[PDB]
């Protein structure tokens, strides 16, 4: 009972590289779909599969192809990736199709970025900043800030860890990253997050705070020729301890 499972969540590609997105549904649905979502426009169908054993083109099939491998699986293939294929891809399924009232069930999405060259791919630099003492005395609360800066493309997941466990209460991470140079189209990104706790929680010296950013980047097969370190998929983090005095 997992619903619609699609992989991978993130992928960076060089122009001309091949890529297959996987999708499976365990709902015994008959109809599957591949969509792309882009800023400022409605979902656009790429290919669909009305039933096991048949597929056909959607509205934007060029540059793609599909295989309905069985009742459960519907894979999407980019044979020669192009920058215009930078998008968020969604697999969906429905019990039947052309049936009128049946709704779609969506996978989590796959975010692809296609680049002419991997020269401008960078992991985030992560730094943590401890609460202002003036805030603590004025409000009896303490806000820590985490900054993830200089990363590209925007394939990151930021989380806060308190005493080795992930927390969500008291956390706000920017919904959209900042372009560090808004004019340039290939600008690197910045992201801020806050964790706010009570002053008494901050003032326990044995409490441990960590800001973690998962970066999705290159892998073993991607060619690297730059002088700097290969910007591989990696986790970058920064930490702070509570302060008594």
């Amino acid at each position: 009972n997992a619903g619609v499972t699609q992989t991978p969540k993130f992928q960076v590609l060089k122009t001309g590289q091949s890529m297959t997105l996987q999708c499976a549904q365990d709902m015994n649905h008959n109809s599957m779909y591949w969509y792309r979502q882009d800023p400022g426009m409605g979902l656009r169908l790429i290919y669909y599969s009305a039933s096991e054993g048949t597929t056909d083109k959607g509205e934007v099939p060029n540059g793609y192809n599909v295989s309905r491998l069985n009742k459960r699986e519907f894979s999407l293939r980019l044979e020669s990736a192009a920058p215009s294929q930078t998008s968020v891809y969604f697999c969906a399924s429905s019990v039947w199709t052309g049936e009128g009232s049946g709704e779609l069930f969506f996978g989590e999405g796959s975010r692809l970025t296609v680049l002419e060259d991997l020269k401008n791919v960078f992991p985030p630099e992560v730094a943590v900043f401890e609460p202002s003492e003036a805030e603590i005395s004025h409000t009896q609360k303490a806000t820590l800030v985490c900054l993830a800066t200089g990363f590209y493309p925007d394939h990151v997941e930021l989380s806060w860890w308190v005493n080795g466990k992930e927390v969500h209460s008291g956390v706000c991470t920017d919904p959209q990253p900042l372009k560090e140079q808004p004019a340039l189209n290939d600008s690197r990104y910045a992201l801020s997050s806050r964790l706010r706790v009570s002053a008494t929680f901050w003032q326990n010296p044995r409490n441990h705070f960590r800001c973690q950013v998962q970066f999705y980047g290159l892998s073993e097969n991607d060619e690297w020729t730059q002088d700097r370190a290969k910007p591989v998929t990696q986790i970058v983090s920064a930490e702070a301890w509570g302060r008594a005095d």
């Binding site: 073993e220 690297w224 002088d227 370190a229 290969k230």
Partner: peptide
Amino acid sequence: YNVLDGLEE
């Protein structure tokens, strides 16, 4: 000299 992954020309 190489110590990390890649190709240096």
